Amino acid sequence: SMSYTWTGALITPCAAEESKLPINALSNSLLRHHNMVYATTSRSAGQRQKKVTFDRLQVLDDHYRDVLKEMKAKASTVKAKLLSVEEACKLTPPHSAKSKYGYGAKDVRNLSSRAVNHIHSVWKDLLEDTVTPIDTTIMAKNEVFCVQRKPARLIVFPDLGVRVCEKMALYDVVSTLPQVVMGSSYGFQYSPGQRVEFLVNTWKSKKNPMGFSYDTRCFDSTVTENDIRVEESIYQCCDLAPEARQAIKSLTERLYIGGPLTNSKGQNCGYRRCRASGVLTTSCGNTLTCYLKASAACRAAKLQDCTMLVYGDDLVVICESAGTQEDAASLRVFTEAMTRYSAPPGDPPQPEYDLELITSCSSNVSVAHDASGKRVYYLTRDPTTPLARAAWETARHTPVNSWLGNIIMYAPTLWARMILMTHFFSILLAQEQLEKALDCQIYGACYSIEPLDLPQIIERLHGLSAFSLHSYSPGEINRVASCLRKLGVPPLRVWRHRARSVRARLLSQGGRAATCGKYLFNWAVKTKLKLTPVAGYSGGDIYHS
Numbered sequence: 395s396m397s398y399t400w401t402g403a404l405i406t407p408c409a410a411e412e413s414k415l416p417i418n419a420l421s422n423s424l425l426r427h428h429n430m431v432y433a434t435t436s437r438s439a440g441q442r443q444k445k446v447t448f449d450r451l452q453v454l455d456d457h458y459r460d461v462l463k464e465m466k467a468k469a470s471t472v473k474a475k476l477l478s479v480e481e482a483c484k485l486t487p488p489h490s491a492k493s494k495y496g497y498g499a500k501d502v503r504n505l506s507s508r509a510v511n512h513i514h515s516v517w518k519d520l521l522e523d524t525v526t527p528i529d530t531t532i533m534a535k536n537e538v539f540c541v542q543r544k545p546a547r548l549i550v551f552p553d554l555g556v557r558v559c560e561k562m563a564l565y566d567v568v569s570t571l572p573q574v575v576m577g578s579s580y581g582f583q584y585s586p587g588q589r590v591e592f593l594v595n596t597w598k599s600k601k602n603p604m605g606f607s608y609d610t611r612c613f614d615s616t617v618t619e620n621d622i623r624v625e626e627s628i629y630q631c632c633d634l635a636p637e638a639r640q641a642i643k644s645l646t647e648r649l650y651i652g653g654p655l656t657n658s659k660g661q662n663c664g665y666r667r668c669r670a671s672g673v674l675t676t677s678c679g680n681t682l683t684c685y686l687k688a689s690a691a692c693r694a695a696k697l698q699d700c701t702m703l704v705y706g707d708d709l710v711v712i713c714e715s716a717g718t719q720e721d722a723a724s725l726r727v728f729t730e731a732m733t734r735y736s737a738p739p740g741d742p743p744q745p746e747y748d749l750e751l752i753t754s755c756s757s758n759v760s761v762a763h764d765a766s767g768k769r770v771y772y773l774t775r776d777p778t779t780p781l782a783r784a785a786w787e788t789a790r791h792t793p794v795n796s797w798l799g800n801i802i803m804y805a806p807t808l809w810a811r812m813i814l815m816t817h818f819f820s821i822l823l824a825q826e827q828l829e830k831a832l833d834c835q836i837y838g839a840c841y842s843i844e845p846l847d848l849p850q851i852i853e854r855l856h857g858l859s860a861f862s863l864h865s866y867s868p869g870e871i872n873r874v875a876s877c878l879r880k881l882g883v884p885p886l887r888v889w890r891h892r893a894r895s896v897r898a899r900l901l902s903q904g905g906r907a908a909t910c911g912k913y914l915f916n917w918a919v920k921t922k923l924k925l926t927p928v929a930g931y932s933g934g935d936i937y938h939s
């Protein structure tokens with residue numbers, strides 16, 4: 395079956411689209427090589443359509459059915475509840491896309507009669523009708539990158555009223571089921587500090603550890619009708635209210651398995667027979683499906699004492715080594731099994747015998763040292779995309795502030811501390827907006843966060859050591875330095891000089907501002923001060939504050 399069929403109608407924008415990096419008076423202080431930064435637009439949608447459109451073949455063996463039975467047994471222990479209309483409304487992001495039927499996200503959150511009445515009618519229709527395909531909108535995403543250009547990603551989502559009903563039927567399920575079914579392998583349960591701890595402990599638990607990442611090419615398109623029905627069967631193992639069972643069946647048949655694609659202008663663009671990127675079950679569904687296929691593939695490859703870590707379509711396996719030649723051979727069998735299950739890799743997997751050489755979710759483990767000189771592990775990444783997006787956000791206000799999300803999730807890194815913290819606190823100081831809450835995304839979920847609360851947030855997610863890490867590895871430092879030269883960002887020595895100023899400015903204001911100065915920028919001073927004291931919903935339209 396083809397992942398998509400297309401009519402020929404274009405994927406259209408709903409507003410003006412900027413591809414070129416916007417520039418203001420602050421831009422050059424961060425980044426000089428402006429032509430290297432670009433944003434994707436609907437003009438490349440055609441290119442993406444070609445990439446994501448292909449035939450899927452699936453051959454399912456006993457390993458697959460064995461693992462599925464085990465997952466269902468665990469799912470059978472979960473008890474999930476329906477959320478009320480009111481609870482589902484409160485989880486709706488303030489700036490979520492408005493309904494076609496005369497109400498928006500703020501109406502939903504406020505429990506307006508019009509919004510609530512339509513939600514009730516959508517819900518009743520889900521109970522009464524388990525066959526009629528539900529409409530979806532297809533859009534090209536606008537995302538910023540550094541050159542070497544990517545074509546726009548496509549997103550597919552149903553109407554607001556449907557999105558609220560998804561929460562009612564499935565929010566409790568997708569929040570609780572994955573951890574029970576997959577145990578320690580469910581990647582979204584960890585904070586960055588907890589994840590690093592798990593990865594290190596998993597590596598040390600093996601006598602002779604080997605590990606590899608496996609990244610499937612266009613995962614959403616490899617997801618078949620079978621996969622989505624198997625996914626439903628796992629959900630239905632839960633102890634559920636009868637009304638929830640019906641709604642989950644209806645949503646699966648009418649939305650999750652596939653449906654018609656409509657552009658922003660209301661024209662039929664085609665039909666989908668694979669994963670929709672913008673439904674509540676996207677993250678949970680991808681995690682379960684990846685875990686199922688990969689667990690079965692481990693058995694086919696006879697990999698010994700496997701510990702898997704899965705988040706959406708991202709996969710890492712750490713296991714007992716059988717020797718270099720033997721490990722390489724076993725990965726070939728693993729990939730052959732995954733391919734039979736419909737999930738071939740973008741690049742063939744490579745066995746690694748050092749934890750730090752494995753990259754997943756664009757990230758790798760690295761080592762620094764705390765004040766006492768003890769080794770502290772932390773997750774980092776190539777800073778190119780974070781810095782490209784920071785430059786865009788310096789000149790343009792955007793729906794999501796990636797810089798804030800990056801500071802929070804990569805707070806221990808030398809690039810987040812020296813560049814992102816220094817740059818944006820200077821900007822916030824100049825506009826007196828330190829107390830202004832900003833929208834950002836952590837693990838696909840939307841959060842409203844004031845910059846002044848960053849010290850407490852960082853401490854809780856990474857520990858107090860995030861404010862005193864030093865003696866970073868030569869490889870990490872070189873990667874950062876190389877990226878700065880590439881983008882025309884000033885060298886780290888300049889940022890240290892700037893941070894002393896920003897620190898001094900923050901201390902001068904007292905209160906929570908001074909606390910930001912003290913903890914976030916203690917790295918910048920020569921004589922240091924004494925420093926003292928969730929889940930995954932990518933595309934799921936989820937909000938917390």
Ligand SMILES: CNC(=O)c1c(-c2ccc(F)cc2)oc2cc(N(CC[C@H]3OB(O)c4ccccc43)S(C)(=O)=O)c(C3CC3)cc12
Pocket residue numbers: 581582585586589593605703704705708709710749752753754755757758759773799800803804835836837838
């Ligand atoms: C299966 N792989 C994993 O669970 C992860 C690994 C990993 C595992 C094994 C290895 F050997 C090496 C690395 O590294 C990871 C790094 C992340 N980072 C999230 C960063 C990024 O993702 B989000 O879309 C996002 C949003 C805002 C800012 C940053 C991010 S995070 C916040 O630093 O932990 C995550 C987030 C849950 C998605 C997951 C993993």
